[PDB]
Amino acid sequence: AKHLKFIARTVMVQEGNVESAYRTLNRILTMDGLIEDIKHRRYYEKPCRRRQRESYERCRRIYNMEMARKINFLMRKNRADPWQGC
Amino acid sequence: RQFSYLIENMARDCGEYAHTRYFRGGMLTNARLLFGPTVRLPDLIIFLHTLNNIFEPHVAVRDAAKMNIPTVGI
């Protein structure tokens, strides 16, 4: 309200491509966490519930990043069987 | 499996026996049912690899001991 306008959360359109500008804006707001933040703020999340959600989301990140790390580590072994028939 | 062919040939050349394939449950502890009541089991089992393909001990290591068969193993 006291800041300058048309600087924050502003994406310029190129060659009249408004779809790509909106997708870029939506991608910006998503990566910075604003879209998920806006949604969680529609109704009050009681602190006990917020702490449980944060714990769940942090455990999911650890599991997902460790499973992804194992997938990338083993992907080289997806090559054809070198000893087929034995 | 990199050495299955090599090991199978070494056994045939020395006049002995090789089992480099998937090991089916009970080859040793249930041999009489699988082969016959008069089947003679091995007197010595030599493991050139003691682990299976999921990095666990080959089941025959435990089953060789159950049948009181001495094992040589790398």
Binding site: K70, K77, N78 | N53, F55
Partner: protein, 117 residues
């Protein structure tokens, strides 16, 4: 980098209060989840809303709304074929990073070992 797990769980020897309260053991399974079918939505409504606009102005006379009708008709045909295309490429995995079925056979060969042998 995976977030740290040191001192995060309620355990003997850990003085602080627990940071994480996992309802499931933080241990990698030998399988990944199945490809989740994406929520479908009504399509071609933009073309459907141009056809139904001319009708309102042309007393629902198809003779005056030919170009808009032909647009909506073609758009529905493209979306009908597009679903047929996607389905084939989804099963083939032409665009997927890997198929859960193929990615689980690979994990079967290198199973996570939470126990001693």
């Amino acid at each position: 980098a995976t977030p740290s797990l040191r001192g995060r769980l309620a355990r003997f020897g850990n003085p602080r209060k627990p940071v994480l309260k996992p309802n499931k053991p933080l241990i990698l399974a030998n399988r990944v989840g199945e490809r989740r079918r994406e929520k479908g939505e009504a399509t071609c409504i933009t073309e459907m809303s141009v056809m139904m606009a001319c009708w309102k102005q042309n007393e629902f006379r198809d003779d005056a709304c030919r170009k808009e009708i032909q647009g909506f008709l073609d758009c529905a045909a493209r979306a009908q074929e597009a679903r047929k295309m996607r389905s084939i490429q989804e099963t083939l995995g032409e665009s997927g990073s890997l198929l859960p079925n193929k990615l689980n056979k690979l994990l079967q060969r290198f199973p996570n070992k939470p126990y001693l042998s």
